[PDB]
Structures are given as structure tokens and as C-alpha cells.
Amino acid sequence: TLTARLYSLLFRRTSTFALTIAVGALFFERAFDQGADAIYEHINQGKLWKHIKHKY
Amino acid sequence: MTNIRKSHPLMKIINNAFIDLPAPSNISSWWNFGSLLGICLILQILTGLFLAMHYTSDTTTAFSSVTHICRDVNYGWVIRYLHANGASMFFICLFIHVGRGLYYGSYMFLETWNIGVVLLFTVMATAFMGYVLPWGQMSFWGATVITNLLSAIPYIGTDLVEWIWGGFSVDKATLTRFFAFHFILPFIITALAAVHLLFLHETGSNNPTGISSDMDKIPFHPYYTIKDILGALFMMLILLILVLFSPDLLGDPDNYTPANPLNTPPHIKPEWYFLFAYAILRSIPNKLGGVLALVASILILILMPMLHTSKQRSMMFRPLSQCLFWMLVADLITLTWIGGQPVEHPFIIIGQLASILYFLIILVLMPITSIIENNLLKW
Amino acid sequence: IWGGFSVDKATLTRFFAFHFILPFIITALAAVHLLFLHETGSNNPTGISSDMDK
Amino acid sequence: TSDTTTAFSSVTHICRDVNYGWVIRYLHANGASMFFICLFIHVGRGLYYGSYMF
Amino acid sequence: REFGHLTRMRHVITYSLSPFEQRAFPHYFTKGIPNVLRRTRACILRVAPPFVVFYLVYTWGTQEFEKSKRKNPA
Amino acid sequence: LVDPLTTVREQCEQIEKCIKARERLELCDQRVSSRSQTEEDCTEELFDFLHARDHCVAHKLFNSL
Amino acid sequence: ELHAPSYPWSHRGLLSSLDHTSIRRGFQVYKQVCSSCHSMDYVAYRHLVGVCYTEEEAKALAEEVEVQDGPNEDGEMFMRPGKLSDYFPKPYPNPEAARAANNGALPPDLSYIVRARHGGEDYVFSLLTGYCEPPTGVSLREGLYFNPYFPGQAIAMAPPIYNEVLEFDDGTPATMSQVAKDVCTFLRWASEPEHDHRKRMGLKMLMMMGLLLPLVYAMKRHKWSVLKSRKLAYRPP
Amino acid sequence: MLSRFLGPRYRELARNWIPTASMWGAVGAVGLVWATDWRLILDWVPYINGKF
Amino acid sequence: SHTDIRVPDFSDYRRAEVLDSTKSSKESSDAR
Amino acid sequence: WLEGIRKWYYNAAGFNKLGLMRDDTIYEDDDVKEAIRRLPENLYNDRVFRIKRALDLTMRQQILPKEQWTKYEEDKFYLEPYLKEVIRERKEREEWAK
Amino acid sequence: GCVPIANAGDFGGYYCPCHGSHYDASGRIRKGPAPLNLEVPTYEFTSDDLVIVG
């Protein structure tokens, strides 16, 4: 299965487990911040400085 | 060959305290609040030290220094309100921790219970002196009322209050020495917590059944490190909900006003985690009797082992004493609510009945009810 | 470390904070120091083990 | 007080107005020098008698 | 107090499974919900009545206090 | 120029809580003015009327602002 | 005691930010109505950049004021145009001149007025919009004005806001309630200038907790399944 | 702590240690008076009261 | 009497990969 | 009547739901420790397994099935005479110490 | 801070204009919940000349 492959390739050794965690932390920070920011600026659309700055 | 975890002198101490420590296999979530307390302590030392990198204890700049921390220091509002709501979380965890000790008879561990009383007093002193530091209206006038309470002491009250002030009133010298004491005290608290754990590990933890668990001990590390981590994450969730969604829920707006010794606030209350005591002291008309009651309401924790009259240790198998315990918790809630209220009808008679009931429960009702339970079980 | 472009107010307040906290870390390190020392006891001026004359 | 407008003044206040404040101030100042004298002698002893073997 | 010298125990057998052989949330709802309800009935009359009394006392004190600040015709 | 708050206040004054409190207030106003020298004051009556009116107004005002 | 109602502010919601155009209109209200008698000691011009004004607009707003600047080569104090790093001008040299100008009352600093009041911007909105005639039986000294939301209901501030008290640059009618709402939004920002960042961090924290707490719970229960499925047998002689 | 310590041997122990206890109490009293320069009492000591 | 000792059935707690006694548990071990 | 009140309190105490006996729940002070040390081996082993089983039950936040609950008439006070003797010995030593 | 009319008074010597707590020569609250009159502190009262007050 997919999880068997993931374990055999990336999880079995602790060094490779840690490397997977580090690369995943980098890409997760990027994607999670992008998504959370988009949610926050959709909830508050038109209310923020960024939305209105282009008039001044 | 050796395992350096077991042979190395430092790692041996660490190993015996948190890795290979035999722990009861059945201690509940209520046994998490020890590890929360020590975490809160660390958080308070961490944010406070970072506050102390910008805060200044001169009365001409303290309130301004705090405004600067929250307005211009990078993430200084985070550190500030993390510190304030972490003091509130410290006291929540302390009250739950002492309530667990009461309910399960953990006070039968005499030395660690007595060290815990010392710790409660020292955390209270630290939080009290820290709250003066922003030098808001509540800071100033709460310091004023609580320090002038000590004048009730016979023959040396005024002399000792003036010595604590370093002057004729709460002023600059008081604020600077309160900053110094507030800085130093949490490290003494750390030492006392270490002594506390040293005394606890002599017997190990009590469990919810109140029965000795040596036949079912599990190693601390895999089980209670992960359980304490989960408890810490839940505590962090509550703390961050406070810090990020209602920063000012448990505080007072009048401390956003700089201290005015000419004008007093309409209401001068301690913080919430003092109100139960502030109610008790305010219930008694006599100044000194009120102070003695406000001190006995926390010294009475030293009496619990001598008040124990049950054949059983914990409250798990004693419905009547559970009833009294929950009445005690309700009376503490009503004392907190009363202490947040003005001294006027009807809160006065309510505070009086609650203050009487607190002592009547701990000192009288709980012992007699344990004896009745003893006879109901025919021993 | 400055908290700014030069040695100034930020540096002074943070130096007060670090100066307050550091001697307590030193106290803990001296306790660990003595813990390690007592594993062997003290050396002596001859440089010879003295367990027969403690 | 660690503000840059009051630090020098606060130390002057300690040495001129606080009761026995100059005693405490100069005790602290020369106790730091005594600390370093003792530290240098302590490390010199360690070097001379091979205490570093611990 | 260390493992290996805590008590004498005899004739007790324990059977355990590897965490990788079993699940971490088995019957979490089909069994957990009845257990929570059982644990709630077991204690509810020991815990709840004091807080009901506090609710009533708080409600009465607050409404009464606010009933004193009202003008009584006189 | 007309203000939203005026029309919102009138509409919310048409509320029966307001309608009852208004004549309670006008019976106080009829007493305190008849009696030549008293300590009352109709601030409590006005406070009831304003509490009702301003609850309704806080429900409806920001929609026109 | 007349407590303020709860108004449906744009920023009341848990993730709801401040409307920054209302913050800009509210700065215009403060800087044209309140500032003659109120100071904002802890808010500087630079603070308004990226919030409701561009750096050029805020530098011109700082240029509009004159601020005293420190001693010259000759040792005199001089007047210079304001700067971004300059804080908002103070209307009165000391509290005593403020009290002298306002019939004994010192008008408060408004940097924390929303935070330093129970009821916050709701209270400030109701105070600004709540000037009525004194009721029958209530008489106030001259220079005092009946306001049911002020403690004692006798306030030394005359009604500051009215219809068309100022003009708004984006063209809104400046009705009294509009002016009050704008200035109250600005005062909420002046008390808590981390509000929007605080709520964005709260959203991220709620997401991270909704991920980690199930995951740490699964970790705890994976390790504990050994104990929780354990079977015991007693086989005495 | 109620009557296990209530007996003839315990009253003998009390009497045996009463002079030592009273001497220690006098030691504490004198030390407290001297440490605090308690004029109330010290104004009576013949030569010591010269300090005041 | 030690031959009288049987491990109790753990089927209720087992992962679905290892509910069958007739199957190698290595074939799911990595996945598990 | 106290068959009622006592059996009611025994039910309400709920250590019977863990398979425990009354004497399984006594707080273990020094006198109780000596009482347990003097216990015959079979009684000691039964007590230890009952306590371990109840600890496991409360670790899982569980109670036994009702058919397995200690019935009140069958709660054996197995530790009472040992404790009584230990207490009597202590009282004798104290009556001597006087 | 609802400052009284110092040295005048509608009743006596001062009066609380913001509130109703007017003042007499003994600076007594005439009608209001202010927890006391103007505070009368520790002094050496023998004469307006000879008052150390503090």
C-alpha cells in the first residue's frame, strides 16, 4: 500500500524519518500559512489595508 | 558496560524522576495538573524575563514601558498577555491541583503537601507583586489596600507596613522593590518545586482509588510523558484562546488607566484568584480578625492530615464526603463571586454565610461525616 | 544583542534582565559542579589518592 | 532602575540617600573583584595540582 | 523505589498486545458514549446539587441587589 | 442632512417596552413636577425607557451607517 | 446605572477584523474634533502607516502639525514641522491647563479609552450619541451636561459630535451616528493595535490545535493501547 | 497527640525540660530585645540604656 | 498447568490487517 | 433500620463495582501495613490481585459487570482481626511508655 | 476627579459640582456616595502656622 511504501522508503530509518519531517515542516509552513491567510482575508474582505490601499 | 542514562550522575537523577519512575497505572487527568504547574512556572519565567528586557520599574515609566512593550516591541503584546493569562492559568492549575489533593487524600504525603502549601503562598506573593508592576489604577490601589491590611498586626503593624513600602505610602520605592522580589521569587519557587518532587518521589504518586498501587506500577516515560504532553497541549489551547481571542477577559479595565493616588477607583478588587480570600477577610468586621481569617483560609490546608477521620484515603468510595467536597467547591465559587462584588446588601450576609461555611465544612462537617461513613461501613 | 543600531536603552534594560537571571543559573551550575566533584571527592596537594586518610 | 535616563541617577540615589546604600553598592562592586580574584586562584590551583583530571 | 523491588506478587498473568497490532480508538463511540453516560449518572447527584445551589444563590443575590438600587416610592 | 439614529430611535420608540416605560416616565414627570420640593428625579424611569430603546436601536442602527 | 447596548461592530466576530476605512475616517474625526482637548500619548504618526494611511499621506499629516524640538546651539527650544516618528500633539502643556480649559475636568488620554472602560466602544458610542435633556427632578450645574451613560449622568464634556461636524474625504454624510461609529472604530484600534494580527494568529492557532490535538491524542492512545487492552488472570495455587 | 503522651513519665519529662526550655525562652527574649534595640525593655538596663 | 494457559482473544482490539490467524502479519507490518 | 442504611451506603460507595472488598480499600498506615504483613499468604495474594484488577478497571474508567460486584453479605472482613491485634499491641506499648 | 469648587461652596466652603456631594467649611459631603469627605490627614494641629501635617 501507499503507507507501506512510505514507511519502507522514509520512516524506517530515524535519519530519513527526520529528514522527511524537516522537508515537510518547510512545505507545511508555506502551504498552511498560504491557506490560513487566504481564509482570513476572505472573512475580512475589503476591510483590510491591502484591499483598500490602492486608492491612496 | 553501562547504560549512561542509569549510570551518569545527572542522567541518573533525570532517569529516576521522569523516565524510570514507577507511576500508578490509573492516575487520571487530575494528576496532569502537576506537570501543568511546572510548565506554567517555566512559561512565566520565560515571558517575564522577556518582559524584563523592556520593562522599567520607575513610576514615571512603568506604565509607559508596558505600553511600549505591547505597542512597539516585536510580538511584545503576545509576550505580555501570555504572561498575564499565564498567571491566571497558573492559579487555575493550582486550585485544581489542591482540590485533587483534598479529594484523593494526597495530603497524607505530609512533606510534599506542606511544601505545596509553601508553594501556594509563594506563587500568591509573586502574582500579587507582579500585578503592581504595570502601575495602573488597580495596581496602585490593590497594593494600597492589601499592604495597609498589615497595619492590623498588633504593635508592629504600622512599622512593618512602612518598612515594606519604604515610605509613608505605596510609591516609587515599593514598585522598584516589588519588581526585584517579583524577579527573584519564581526561582525560589523553582527550588521549592524541586524539593517538592524530591519529597513526592519518596513514596510516588497516590491514585484515585486511594489504595497503594505498587503491584501495578508502569514506567513514567512512555505513558505519562505522552499523557502530560497531551495535557500540556490542551492547557496551551485554553491559554492561547485567552491570549488571542479575549486578552482582557480575566483582567480589569482600570489598570489601563495610569495610577492616580488622588483618585480612587469605585471598585478596588484583587485579581480573581484572590477574591475567595478577599471575601473571607471582608466578611469579618474586625480588621485583625479579618486578616487572621484571610490567612487561616490558606493555613487550614496544613490541618487536613490531622482532620482526616476516614478509614479510607481518597473520596472515591465515600459519597457523603464527595457531597461535602462539592459543597466546598461551590462555597469557594460563591466566595469568589462575593469578593468581586461591593460590600452592600445582600452580598454581605451571603459572604458571611459562605465564609462561615468554608471553615465549618473543612473543620467540622468533613471530619464528622467521615466518622459517620466509617460506622456505616462497620469500622 | 543591541536591540538597535548601537548600545542604548534596549541594551541596558536587557542587560539588567540577563544580569539578574544569570547568577541563579550560576547557582545551579555550581550545584551540578559539586555533584560531579563528590563522585570522587577532592584532589589533594600530593596528587595521590588519599582514601586511607579521609 | 534600568532606564537610561535614571540608571546613573538611581545608583547615585543608592549611594547618597538609601540608608547604608553605599555599603551595599561598594560591597557589590568589590565583591565582583573578590569573586574574580578567587576564581583565578581557584583555576590556578586546578592547573597546579592537576585537578582538571576530574 | 525502583522496578524490581516494589512488592511481592504471585500467580498473576498479564496478556498484552503490541500497539502496532491493535487500534488506538476501538469502539470509541459505540462503547465510549455509554461509558460517559454511566460515569455521569454515577456522580451527578454528588456533584450537581451544590452548583445548582450556587446558581440559585447567585441569581437571588444579583436580582435582590439590583432590587435595592430601585427607587422605592417615599 | 438626516441622521439614521433619529429615525431608528423613533421606530424603536414604537416598541411596547418603550411604550410602557414612556408613560411610567410621564407619570413620574407628572408627580415630581406637581410636588413642589422632593428628592426624586425621574432618572430611573428614563433609564428603563432608554435601555429598551437602545437595545432595539443597537439591533437596527449600523445597517444604515 | 445605564449600561451600554451591544452594537454589531464589524470587528466583534471571533476572526472578524477592523474595517480600516472606518479607522481612517475615525482618525479624521479624532484629529479634527477630539484632539483639541484630548491627547493620544502612545500613538504616533508612523503607527498609521499600513493601517489607514500610506507613508506619504501620514508624513503630510505629520507636516500639518508643529512640534517643539529640543535645544538649539544657542540653547533655545524651537518649533519644527512634525515627523512620522513624532507622537500625536498634546493640546495642553500639563494636566492643570487641561483642567483650567475644561471647567475643572481633565479630558482623558484616548490611547486606551476603549480598553479602560467597561463596555468599550459600545460605551463610547452610547456616550457620544446619548446626550438627552435632564429628566424631571434632575438639575446640573452650568458647564455640565446630562448623559445617561456617564457615571453620575453629569458629564463635563459638551456634546462634541453633531451632524456635519466635519467633512469626510471619501464623501460619507457626516451624520452624528456615522461620526461616532468611525471614531469608535479608531479608538478600538488605538487601544489594541494588534487586533487584526491577534485574530489572524488565533485562526492559525485554532487550525493547528484542530490538527495537533487529534494527532497527539492518537499518539497517547497508540502508546496506551498496550495497557488499555491488557488482560489479567489470577492463577493461585 | 491527645492522651498517648498523657502520663506520669510525660509529666516527669516536662518538668525535666522546663528549666532548659525556660532558659532557652529567656535566650530568645534577650536576643530579640538586643537585635531590635527594643527601647521599651532596654530603657531599664542600667548601662546599656546609655545608648538611648 | 502452564499448558492450561491460553492467550485471550484480542480480536476486538486488533487492526483489520491482522484479524485472520491464517495470514502472515509481515504482509501488513510495514503498512501497520 | 441499619441493614438498609448500611447496605445502601455499601452500594453507594461503589468499591463493590470494582470487585473490591471493604478491607481492600483501607488507608494503609503503619498499623494497617503490619496487619497486611501478618496476613496469611493466600489472603495476601487474593487481596493483591483484587487491588490490581480494580486499579486496571479504574485505569480504563470501567466497572465490573453487575454479576461480578462484591455482594454486601459476602464482603469478608479478612483484615479486621489482624488490624485489631496490631492496634492492641501499639496501645500496649503506649500504655507502657506512660 | 469631579473636582469640587475649592474655596467657595454652594453649602459651605467647597461643593461637588459634577456630583451632588457639596462641602461645608469642614469639607463635608452634603449628598453623595463618595466614601468620605475630603480626607483630613495626620497633622500637628495647634495653628495654621504650626501644622507639620505631612
Ligand code: HEM
Ligand atoms: C509551584 C507549584 C506546584 C508545582 C510545580 C507542583 C508540582 C507537582 C507535580 C509535578 C506533582 C506530581 C504530579 C501530580 O500528581 O500532579 C505534584 C504532586 C503533588 N503536589 Fe504539587 N505542585 C505545586 C503546588 C502544590 C500545591 C499548592 C499543593 C497543595 C498544597 C501541592 C501538593 C501536591 C501533592 C499532595 C502531590 C501528590 C499528589 C498525589 O500523588 O496524589 N503541590 N506536584
Ligand code: HEM
Ligand atoms: C511565578 C511566576 C510568575 C507569576 C505568577 C507572575 C505574575 C505576574 C503578573 C500577574 C503580572 C501582571 C501582568 C499584567 O500586566 O496584567 C506580572 C508582571 C510582570 N512580570 Fe511576572 N510573574 C512571574 C514570573 C516572572 C518572572 C520570573 C519575571 C522576570 C524574569 C517576571 C517579570 C514580570 C514583568 C517584567 C512584569 C511587568 C510586565 C507586565 O505587566 O506584563 N515575571 N507577573
Ligand code: HEM
Ligand atoms: C562559580 C564559581 C565556582 C564555585 C562556587 C566553585 C566551587 C567549588 C568548590 C566548593 C569546590 C570544592 C572546594 C575546593 O577544592 O575548592 C570546587 C572544586 C573544584 N572546582 Fe570549582 N567552583 C567554581 C568555579 C570553578 C572554575 C572556574 C573551575 C575551573 C575550570 C573549577 C574547577 C574546580 C575543580 C577542578 C575542583 C576540584 C579541585 C580539587 O579537588 O583539586 N571551579 N569548586
